[PDB]
């Protein structure tokens, strides 16, 4: 539904939109092509992925500059197929009595919850990630700045790739003619701006030209003078920038792709702050007030931590970490193929559109990308598409351990500590207090990877 | 005083990295002040 | 001649220098030995045993350096050996083996079961035969 | 050789280079009943 | 799940509880009920998996009582003949002869004859010494007319259990032998068609292992 | 640490002149252990002419 | 110590630090073995980091 | 042996010409 | 390892290609001779970026084939001896792990693998797993290895690696 | 282990 | 330019240029001049020299190591 | 007679400048794009395809900006060109990891400064998820 409209041009305008998605129960397509039901047990024996067909309704509106708009309906287009977790709502073994499961050569005591790919049972290991739309203030002694205003902000389940902004505060260690006088000033790095721009200027770009409005959104208690003195140095750097247009010009100066003309710099900065920055609080063009308030809160949270009146956020606190299951994981993957699916349709139609003749949709939609795309990572374990120039996250979708029933249960509830900067900075191996009643403390594999892999608590 | 020992120090001994973890120095006093407690405080201040 | 790794079990009866080894592992392992008149008959009987029987020789090397497989045994004359030959007789009792750079040698003793026996005084290991 | 369907469990003779499918079901999985050559078992 | 099955974990040391979590997974036993129908590369099933005498209330929810992975033993803690060190244990030979800890082992072999090349393709048939040029010394009487060994035939050492040949541009033998030298009897044979439509088969070789001096036994903790 | 130490002293050996030298033949110590005695045969004792 | 007292003083200081950590847990090592390690490191007149290759 | 001069091909002069077949 | 180089290659051009704009034929010919091949001295020539210049075409006496010395910019994959680089496992056998370092294939011997590792033929698929099971090397697994030596065979470079050195494995 |  | 060699074409140069061109013509090389039924390759190259169309460029190596690029058309042939 | 650990190799490669696995993918993509559409030519060699997957799988950076930033950051130091691509390609997790993998770095880099360089590479490299 949230897919961008597909536009093709080269007079003949084609607009393709996906209306609704229809999902059927799993079936097996042989050389005859009959939609025979596909039992989960048959998949393992025949070494084929257990999955269900995916169907999408596509509506296309075509205008040839003749002031006559006509559209055609494509009912249940064979977009592709989606692997189905066993015992799920769309699985063939949902709501079935124990008697029926035996008839299908399936263990009634088997809990399910895995995917059968090429005859191999795979379990999507939950990958802990830092919680989104949350403000965290950490202290690092290696960075050039004393404190970090890290806050990764994202919209609902997923509309755009996650964007993170670090509202840092320069350390007092550095000394200079003017730096020492003002001392500690706040600098905010925008996601698409390479250099660190002062946070005060960001508010000016929003529309709050008046300096008092800046203090109003940051400092809620004017009676308290301790916090007020901390924000004074930040104003000095941004003081010369009084007009909002200048602030927009200032931000666009260090943009990733600065515009050749002066007016383009303002437009690029306007788009970055409006869309790239703080997507979760607002994505439209009339959320300047809302965006500023959240931005001021991030500064306000930094002020409390800097003064010490607020305790620093704990890196290992599980409340600050979110767990990504087969649902959230596959949701991110589905966008990879779907985004590529639009490109394949666009590229295929591009050569057709310029020639002037209509392009059939049956050839445009690619089933292999949707089918093989999900099947690839779920089998090898390398998350994401292989073609993309990146490093895939290995260790996900491991072979289910069927040596013992207890092992199978533990593997399905298995958890994985975050990898990369988040895991490296924190101590995932060490047992934290938050694990009480949520993650089993005793259970952990022995070896170098001790504590990284855990198991969900029973309740 | 916290003096790093064990593997962390053994690693820092074979490795000649210029900056160890806790490069402590032991100062031995001599003369009359070496016995008195107060007379050793001024040395403490003048070193700290 | 690296052997197949197998688990370790204790055996106080064996001496600390001695090490227990199964028949199957010792059968695969071979120890080239130069035949001499004082032990010409000893090699003559062992080669006759064949590879089906555990106390046999996997290969026999002539003076010219040619290796003849004893599994086939095509001609009785080829089985016969002359002085100065090298025979890869299977490991037997009293042989010296070395395993875990400081390595400790041991005297192999053949035992019925499969697992290795060590007079500790668990972890898998492979024993090398010089 | 004689095989057994995995759904109806009925005998179906399948020759060499013949499609693997049950006439009564169309099931694509077939098993082998047993070998007439018996083996020796010792209670140990 | 793995820590719940442990009685008195509070009475136990933290590393021991963590150590059991690894050992519990490595424990062999009845993993599911429909093990005969499925084909798994590695599957160890215990002869007599009985529920423990000391069981936790949470064990009921895990269903470990229905499908346990061990056999209780009357253990006498003593130093007998000095044949047991800190990492060792002494068993009762007579008990093993009665089925004390015996278990089965299943190894599934898979192979498909696919027409990868127009000129050269794979087929299932008996690799006769005459029609085949390149072959490895092994007994081929086990294979049937279809190139697949029928269930109920004892297999030991190096033996061909599925016949496959490639018609190189005369055919070259490329059959699959036993992974190890263990003596086992084929349990069941399955012939199917893979997703590509080519003939594909799976066979489960079943072998019986008797506990011996080399087997590793672990308690529920330690 | 064990592997690193062995490599840096793998070539260190006692030559026939009762000297410790490496592969390059550089004199690491004039006498092994500064006394020229094996570390296994030495036994702990306390001479009583100083206390 | 190297920049203040010289390489020769480091040999004794290195011995003391090596012995201090080894004797902290009650374990003991023959002095000859400890002296050999210090001599090799200081054999070239300057402190030498132990070979990081560690192939053997 | 007649090596004081070398024959070099020129692309500019090859711009004109039709193949006999 | 990938490098940027400027190489020289003498292009043999048939007189049949002496038609108009023959330099284009020489340019396109260079995209087939030095492209996709593997010189034993500079390694695999994976791709060609651009052409520097084309030298004068000297006609070889008697042969009648014009020789065109052309300079081009290309990227080569030359495995230097004693260099540690990531690799991808393509197959596993009792002899040892078979890795794939980009265009070439590198073989790891059993002895070079640490003694703790033990080959498992029962596990599907095969993977060198130690007894502790902490580290396992499956197929298509990103592992780091050090090339002890490289040999050139049949116009191809074959490399031998090892994992005895520290920090060589899954990480 | 041994059968391998 | 600044070429000091004789404007005329030596007999040795003429023989090699025609021989190399004739070999090229026999190898399906294009012919600049019009073809009026001359089958023998030497005749095809001979008229090419007459019409000053041979693409071959003569690089005369001076004894001092310098070279001069003299075109066949530029050189004065004798007919 | 050549060894990468001791920084000994044929003199020809000295003039050559090293390239990153992710960066080479961009160059291969540029080569792939023109061949696919710009000119009608035979399909690319199997060698080209094999290295393209290797670079893509091990690509540690998303866009040119990330690649350029790391290249510029490491250029400021005295890092040798051979180590420039080797360090970036390997992505050592910690300083101790790099020195053992790269013996050359131990010669002229301290345990502290290099750690401040590897962690910078970590902040630049990104995962697909
Ligand atoms: Zn049926």
Author numbering:
A (entry chain N): 60 to 69, 81 to 529
B (entry chain M): 1115 to 1162
C (entry chain M): 360 to 459, 467 to 487, 498 to 506
D (entry chain X): 15 to 58
E (entry chain N): 706 to 874, 888 to 940
F (entry chain M): 860 to 910
G (entry chain M): 1365 to 1420
H (entry chain A): 1467 to 1487
What is written in the article reporting this PDB entry?
Eukaryotic gene transcription is carried out by three RNA polymerases: Pol I, Pol II and Pol III. Here we present the cryo-electron microscopy (cryo-EM) structure of a mammalian Pol II dimer at 3.5 Å resolution. The structure differs from the Pol I dimer and reveals that one Pol II copy uses its RPB4-RPB7 stalk to penetrate the active centre cleft of the other copy, and vice versa, giving rise to a molecular handshake. The Pol II dimer is incompatible with nucleic acid binding as required for transcription and may represent an inactive storage form of the polymerase.
The addition of DDM at a final concentration of 0.008% (w/v) increased the amount of Pol II dimers observed on the grid and enabled determination of the structure to 3.5 Å resolution with C2 symmetry enforced. The dimer is formed through a handshake-like interaction between the stalk of one Pol II copy and the active centre cleft of the other copy. In the resulting 2-fold symmetric arrangement, the two stalks are arranged near the centre of the complex with the cores of the two Pol II copies on the periphery. There was no cryo-EM density for the clamp domains in any of our reconstructions and no significant protein degradation was observed for either RPB1 or RPB2 by SDS-PAGE, indicating that the clamp is mobile. The Pol II–Pol II dimer interface is formed through an intimate interaction between the RPB4-RPB7 stalk of one Pol II copy and numerous elements of the core of the other Pol II copy, formed by RPB1 and RPB2. The stalk nestles deeply in the active center cleft of the other Pol II copy and buries ∼2100 Å2 of surface area per copy. The residues in the dimer interface cluster in three areas of the Pol II core that we term interfaces A, B and C. Interface A is formed by specific interactions between RPB4 of the primary copy with fork loops 1 and 2 (FL1 and FL2) of RPB2 in the partnering copy. With respect to the two other interfaces, interface B is formed between RPB7 in one copy and the site that binds the DNA–RNA hybrid in an EC, including the active site of the other Pol II copy. Finally, interface C is formed by interactions of RPB4 and RPB7 with RPB1 residues 1417–1419 that are located in the switch 1 region that connects the Pol II core to the mobile clamp. Furthermore, RPB4 sterically clashes with the incoming downstream DNA, the OB fold of RPB7 clashes with the DNA–RNA hybrid, and the tip domain of RPB7 clashes with the upstream DNA duplex.
